[PDB]
Design a protein around this ligand. Structure first.
Ligand SMILES: Nc1nc2c(ncn2[C@@H]2O[C@H](COP(=O)(O)OP(=O)(O)OP(=O)(O)O)[C@@H](O)[C@H]2O)c(=O)[nH]1
Ligand SMILES: Nc1ncnc2c1ncn2[C@@H]1O[C@H](COP(=O)(O)OP(=O)(O)CP(=O)(O)O)[C@@H](O)[C@H]1O
Ligand SMILES: Nc1nc2c(ncn2[C@@H]2O[C@H](COP(=O)(O)OP(=O)(O)O)[C@@H](O)[C@H]2O)c(=O)[nH]1
Ligand SMILES: [Ca+2]
Ligand SMILES: [Ca+2]
Ligand SMILES: [Ca+2]
Ligand SMILES: [Cl-]
Ligand SMILES: [Mg+2]
Ligand SMILES: [Mg+2]
Ligand SMILES: [Mg+2]
Ligand SMILES: [Mg+2]
Lengths: 351, 423, 54, 442
């Protein structure tokens, strides 16, 4: 009889995982502050990693990687890419990005305009987005960006806006791709074979960057502020079977060749970069964690990483499968009970 | 922390105390004449905790024997180890106490108690460093109960910085001498709550049930109850009588077992319950925590453990003992209070008790002990609400108010346990 | 990666390697505290003995 | 030459002292009867080893050491054991009843009656010193004497030797070998009272030593003897620069200067490699690269914690055996490109390196294999505050219910000292966080 504790009550994924664990009849849930657990499904903020792994007679496992926030915060991700040799500034799949602190509060504001001006000079599309880790501005004029940033009080990021996105027809409309990645205690990287396209139901419009429902494919901003939520697909959600058949019919490619190769390359590069900082291979406790990677596809079928989410929810159709997979490869791998839905990402090129 | 002074009071106190001295004199290789004849010198390293050394290398129990009638102490003096005791430490009256707490505490016992304290003082004065006192008695009679609690009060007055420890046999209607036992027991518990540091609750209910259900004795005698008691007493004092790290003196035990001054009533347990089958470390561990091995008729699942001391005896794997203790805690963690971290402490002693190659003794501070006190309370109220049998007590000068007060204090103790069971 | 302050002797050697540059109460008070604690002990004992005298 | 006096308090302090002085004697060729054939200046001298040993006309080398315990059984084993003749009776001080795992009993009740005798025996030792540097104090956090008496002694040493340095070696409590439920209380209490009086303190978590003994020495159930022989190796590795010729950490002041830029953050993490079982039939000797790399595995630390998720303020490598600087610098270069080693901004990223060519000495018949080179890393990393976090959590759990507090109040301690000590620990955890961390349904 294995034991576990639940310290995040607002998590779809791990609510479903707890229910499956109980249904096995080999897992017992304890009170959130009982220390004699095998498994901690922990809180998202200030999780006490320092108290794990000091319980004699208990192999202990937690569903977060201490240190993985460097990937999963806007400013820390841009810092990690620009400063890590294996990602480098010569990184072809991350959009040009700069970290900027409000005037109220290193910062990169000077270096940002250095390139902004050879895009003013150079005739190039000079549209940029500003975001923080609600509160988005898209503009071709830098000073609207900087002033909007200093109007707020937290650190923001300025990132090149991708002006030529791939657009689904019918609709002439934007989307982003969400991939779910499980990293187990052995640092196997498992991509869930089902992704989801969060589409916009509004046609794209390169002239008014201020009506942000053809520009922000977030399921929330589409579920209310947009007119056509659910026209083409249920809940602005296209899945991989459909998107693949579309690529085959319209572009004469597959999802595998034109997009997924890049996505796997990006996931493996990010996680292998931070692996020495977060691995629990020789630690007194062990970690796994579920990530959501968010990608954009431009019109030449080039994939761009937009961000990484350290605590993602699932698509409602997929919970059942994904959560069962989490118990299969992340939990029962460590604590055995009495056609994999994942692709293992591994590659050993010799040179 | 070296010497312990032992006191046994009344019929039950003296019968079980004599069995206790027999058992541990056997363990320490001391023979009925006080001569050492053992093979290990772990037998002698801490022999002075319980024995004085006379010359001839004779070992004399630091034991004072107390009664208000001479009957049981004559039988002790004629029993197996009767002559080992120091003759001047037999302190007895002639009149008896009539199963009456008031006679033991206020009238007959008051006449004898100074005699007892003279012997107690002569024994304490020859102590290099007295740790304190242990008393064996019942709560259901008059001498062990009334005079026993009188003695405890007087000893605390004269040695307020020493540990006071009792083995207290609780009355049960299933094994009962008179109808007034709930009165005597309630009055005594009131004293114990205030004036002892650690009390082993031995329930004649539980001893009976073990003898009947488990040892397949159809007609248990006091003799059979006292076998269980003397085995348990030997177990719970192992750590005081042999070299070791954990709970090796009375104060350190108190510090580990008593998180709140009044909640010092312990549920003891023993395994294996007594054959030639070998018992494995997992089997010892499961049995010692089994409700059916507890000497206090309380369901441990009805409460939570505040603290636990476990003592394994014999040659076995330390690694396996640690693993099994960890396993019981980890798989029944709900029953140990989460606000006392690491509240289960484990000792191992290489010398097993007579007739066994392996044994385990359990000492639990469980909130489930409240079931014992509730039981006494109900039996008390059933009579007290009609003031039945009171005249035996008012005839010795007691007033009903003293009963009302002792009942209220016992119900307060029950409430305090319930508080920590829900904290 | 710079090695400095190298010192050698028959017993061994020491040095430093830089990879990157920088980017009480009196006797009085004590005895007062010990004696305040002893007095709290003596008061608690006197309260106990008063109760036992009653 | 400047002398150091060692003070061993309580069971843990005394048994660890036994093991350390045994080792020292083996390392300097001093026989159990105190004679040292290789010491050619009979009856005196100011060699490096005289920092720890004084000399008699008969040629006896006598530890500069005081043993204190509030009960006699443990120091009696010193009085009658293998090194009976090393120590002079006046250096071994016992009471008769101990502190019952109760800080308040060791500090207020029994401490008050023994402190003056102890300070007088310490004063005798200091009177035979031409230039005392200060003190090395060994004790447990969890015991009543180790916590309570040690904190009293520390305050009084600050009073009577106000300019001397004071170093601690402290055993942090582990349930697998602990003797008492109230050890979190005692720990916090003694840390609170000792903090401003200690210049540098080396914490040893019994849980880390216990797992090292099981995993690398293949001891199924380690005893205090196993633990203490390993601890004595680490301690000797740390003090070797006071006892041998060299230029790193040659006096107590240098430990603070090299390891403690902020005086409250004075708890360096020790990491030791290699630990090799003596019954291991076939062993391939580890290189400079491998043992230096092992300095960065949490499994080899004296406190289990994760230095990747904190920052370094200082780092010292202490090597014993066949080691030359070029191999050290190559190993460090390799390691810095494969591991997470972040220093605080206001400190240089670098290592101070000491090499003594004599490889570790091991006790004949002990558990530890002889090896050709070994290393002890002393790093001041904020990650050691994980241990404080653990202690403070257990303290909070019990004190919220006032469980066991009456034992301390009954010794004359005021309940408010509990919350004072706990708030000092909260400040301390806050300091570690300020130094070591940066500002941090989808
Ligand atoms: N590593 C190690 N730890 C020890 C040793 N002896 C005791 N301990 C630990 O120290 C704590 C107990 O404190 P002790 O040093 O025994 O207590 P004490 O200082 O003698 O104080 P009192 O007995 O209460 O008077 C527990 O955490 C023990 O596991 C030892 O020899 N080696
Ligand atoms: N550089 C960029 N270029 C073009 N479009 C971008 C972009 N960055 C973000 N977007 C658009 O904004 C949306 C992403 O916003 P953001 O990266 O801040 O996610 P979020 O934190 O608001 C919710 P979630 O964490 O679930 O993704 C995408 O749908 C995308 O269409
Ligand atoms: N377990 C046990 N209980 C006893 C024994 N003798 C008497 N009792 C119980 O003790 C109580 C009677 O007290 P007793 O010791 O005879 O009275 P006292 O002589 O006045 O102290 C009742 O609860 C009896 O069941 C005995 O030898 N063993
Ligand atoms: Ca009379
Ligand atoms: Ca000399
Ligand atoms: Ca100071
Ligand atoms: Cl001075
Ligand atoms: Mg986000
Ligand atoms: Mg009778
Ligand atoms: Mg008289
Ligand atoms: Mg001790």
């Amino acid at each position: 009889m294995y034991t576990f504790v639940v310290r995040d009550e607002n998590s779809s994924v791990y609510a479903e995982v707890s229910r499956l664990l109980l249904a096995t009849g080999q897992w017992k849930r304890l009170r959130k502050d009982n220390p004699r657990f095998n498994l901690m499904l922990g809180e998202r903020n200030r999780l006490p990693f320092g108290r794990l792994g000091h319980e004699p007679g208990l192999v202990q496992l937690v569903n977060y990687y201490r240190g993985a926030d460097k990937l999963c915060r806007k400013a820390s991700l841009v810092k990690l890419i620009k400063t890590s040799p294996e990602l480098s500034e010569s990184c072809t799949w991350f959009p040009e990005s700069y970290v900027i602190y409000p005037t109220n509060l290193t910062d990169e504001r000077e270096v940002f305009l250095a390139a902004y001006n050879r895009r003013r000079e150079g005739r190039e599309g000079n549209v940029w987005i500003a975001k923080s880790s609600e509160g988005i501005l898209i503009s071709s004029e830098a000073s609207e960006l900087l002033d909007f940033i200093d109007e707020q009080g937290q650190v923001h990021v300025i990132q090149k806006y991708l002006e030529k996105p791939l657009l689904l027809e019918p609709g002439h409309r934007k989307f982003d791709i969400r991939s779910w990645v499980l990293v187990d205690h052995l640092y196997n990287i498992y991509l869930y074979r089902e992704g989801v396209l969060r589409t916009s139901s509004e046609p794209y419009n390169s002239a008014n960057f201020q009506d942000k429902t053809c520009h922000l494919t977030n399921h929330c901003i589409q579920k209310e502020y947009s007119k056509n939520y659910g026209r083409y697909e249920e809940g602005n959600e296209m899945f991989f079977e459909e998107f693949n058949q579309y690529l085959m019919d319209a572009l004469n490619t597959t999802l595998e060749n034109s997009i997924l190769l890049q996505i796997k390359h990006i996931i493996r590069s990010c996680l292998m970069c931070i692996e020495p900082a977060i691995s629990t291979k020789h630690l007194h406790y062990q970690s796994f964690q579920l990530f959501g990677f968010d990608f954009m596809v431009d019109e030449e079928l080039k994939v761009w990483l937009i961000e990484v989410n350290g605590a993602p929810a699932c698509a409602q159709k997929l919970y059942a499968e994904l959560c069962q997979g989490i118990v299969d490869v992340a939990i029962s791998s460590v604590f055995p009970l009495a056609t994999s839905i994942f692709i293992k990402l591994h590659h050993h090129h010799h040179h | 922390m070296r010497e312990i002074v032992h006191i046994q009071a009344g019929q039950c106190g003296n019968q079980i105390g004599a069995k206790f001295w027999e058992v541990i004199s056997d363990e320490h290789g001391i023979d009925p004449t006080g001569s050492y004849h053992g093979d290990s010198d772990l037998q002698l390293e801490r022999i002075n905790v319980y024995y004085n050394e006379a010359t001839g290398n004779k070992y004399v129990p630091r034991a004072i024997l107390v009664d208000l009638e001479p009957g049981t102490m004559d039988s002790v003096r004629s029993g197996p180890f009767g002559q080992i005791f120091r003759p001047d430490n037999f302190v007895f009256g002639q009149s008896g106490a009539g199963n009456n707490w008031a006679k033991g505490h206020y009238t007959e016992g008051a006449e004898l108690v100074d005699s007892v304290l003279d012997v107690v003082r002569k024994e304490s004065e020859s102590c290099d460093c007295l740790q304190g006192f242990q008393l064996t008695h019942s709560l259901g009679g008059g001498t062990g109960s009334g005079m026993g609690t009188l003695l405890i009060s007087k000893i605390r007055e004269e040695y307020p910085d020493r540990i006071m420890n009792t083995f207290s046999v609780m009355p049960s209607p299933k094994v009962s001498d008179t109808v007034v036992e709930p009165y005597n027991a309630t009055l005594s518990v009131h004293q114990l709550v205030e004036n002892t540091d650690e009390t082993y609750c031995i329930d004649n209910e539980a001893l009976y049930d073990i003898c009947f259900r488990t040892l397949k004795l159809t007609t248990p005698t006091y003799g059979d109850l006292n076998h269980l008691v003397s085995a348990t007493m030997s177990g719970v004092t192992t750590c005081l009588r042999f070299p070791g790290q954990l709970n090796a003196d009375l104060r350190k035990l108190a510090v580990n077992m008593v998180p709140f001054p009044r909640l010092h009533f312990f549920m003891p347990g023993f395994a294996p319950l007594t054959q030639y089958r070998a018992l494995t470390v997992p089997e010892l561990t499961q049995q010692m925590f089994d409700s059916k091995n507890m000497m206090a008729a309380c369901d441990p699942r009805h409460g939570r453990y505040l603290t636990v001391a476990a003592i394994f005896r014999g040659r076995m794997s330390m690694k396996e003992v640690d693993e099994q203790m960890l396993n019981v805690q980890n798989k029944n963690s709900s029953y140990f209070v989460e606000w006392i971290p690491n509240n289960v402490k484990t000792a191992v002693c290489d010398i097993p008790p007579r007739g066994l190659k392996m044994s385990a003794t359990f000492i639990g501070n469980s909130t489930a002990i409240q079931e014992l006190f509730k039981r006494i309370s109900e039996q008390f109220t059933a009579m007290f609400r009609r003031k039945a049998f009171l005249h035996w007590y008012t005839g010795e000068g007691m007033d009903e108010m003293e009963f009302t007060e002792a009942e209220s204090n016992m119900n307060d103790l029950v409430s305090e346990y319930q508080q920590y069971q829900d904290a | 990666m710079e090695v400095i302050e190298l010192n050698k002797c028959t017993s061994g050697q020491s040095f430093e390697v830089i990879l990157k540059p920088p980017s009480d109460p009196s006797l009085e008070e004590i005895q007062k505290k010990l004696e305040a604690a002893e007095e709290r002990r003596k008061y608690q004992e006197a309260e106990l003995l008063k109760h036992l005298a009653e | 030459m400047r002398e150091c006096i060692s003070i061993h308090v309580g069971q843990a302090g005394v048994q660890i002292g036994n093991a350390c002085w045994e080792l020292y004697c083996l390392e300097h060729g001093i026989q159990p009867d105190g004679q040292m054939p290789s010491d050619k200046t009979i009856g005196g001298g100011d060699d490096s080893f005289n920092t720890f040993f004084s000399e008699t006309g008969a040629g006896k080398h006598v530890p500069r050491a005081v043993f204190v315990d509030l009960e006699p059984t443990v120091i009696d084993e010193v009085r009658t054991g293998t090194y009976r003749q090393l120590f002079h009776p006046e250096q071994l001080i016992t009471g008769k009843e101990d502190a019952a795992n109760n800080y308040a009993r060791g500090h207020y009740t029994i401490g008050k009656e023994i402190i003056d005798l102890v300070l007088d025996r310490i004063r005798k030792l200091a009177d035979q010193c031409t230039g005392l540097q200060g003190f090395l104090v060994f004790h447990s956090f969890g015991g009543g004497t180790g916590s309570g008496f040690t904190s009293l002694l520390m305050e009084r040493l600050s009073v009577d030797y106000g300019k001397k340095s004071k170093l601690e070696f402290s055993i942090y409590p582990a349930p697998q070998v602990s003797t008492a439920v109230v050890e979190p209380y005692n720990s916090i209490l003694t840390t609170h009272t000792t903090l401003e009086h200690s210049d540098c303190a080396f914490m040893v978590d019994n849980e880390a030593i216990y797992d090292i003994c099981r995993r690398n020495l293949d001891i199924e159930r380690p005893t205090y003897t196993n633990l203490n022989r390993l601890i004595s190796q680490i301690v000797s590795s740390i003090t070797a620069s006071l006892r041998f010729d060299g230029a790193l950490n040659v006096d107590l002041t240098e430990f603070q200067t090299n390891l403690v830029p902020y005086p409250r953050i004075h708890f360096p993490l020790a990491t030791y490699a290699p630990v090799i079982s003596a019954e291991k039939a076939y062993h391939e000797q580890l290189s400079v690269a491998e043992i230096t790399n092992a300095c960065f595995e949490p499994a080899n630390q004296m406190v289990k914690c994760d230095p990747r998720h904190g920052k370094y303020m200082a780092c010292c490598l202490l090597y014993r055996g066949d080691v030359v600087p070029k191999d050290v610098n190559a190993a460090i270069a390799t390691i810095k490109t494969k591991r997470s080693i972040q220093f605080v901004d206001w400190c240089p990223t670098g290592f101070k390196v000491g090499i003594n060519y004599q490889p570790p000495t091991v006790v004949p018949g002990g558990d530890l294999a002889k090896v050709q080179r070994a290393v002890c890393m002393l790093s001041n990393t904020t990650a050691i505050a994980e241990a404080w976090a653990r202690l403070d959590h257990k303290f909070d759990l019990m004190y919220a219910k006032r469980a066991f507090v009456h034992w301390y109040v009954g010794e004359g301690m005021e309940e408010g000292e509990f919350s004072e000590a706990r708030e000092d620990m909260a400040a301390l955890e806050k300091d570690y966080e300020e130094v070591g961390v940066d500002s941090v349904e989808e």
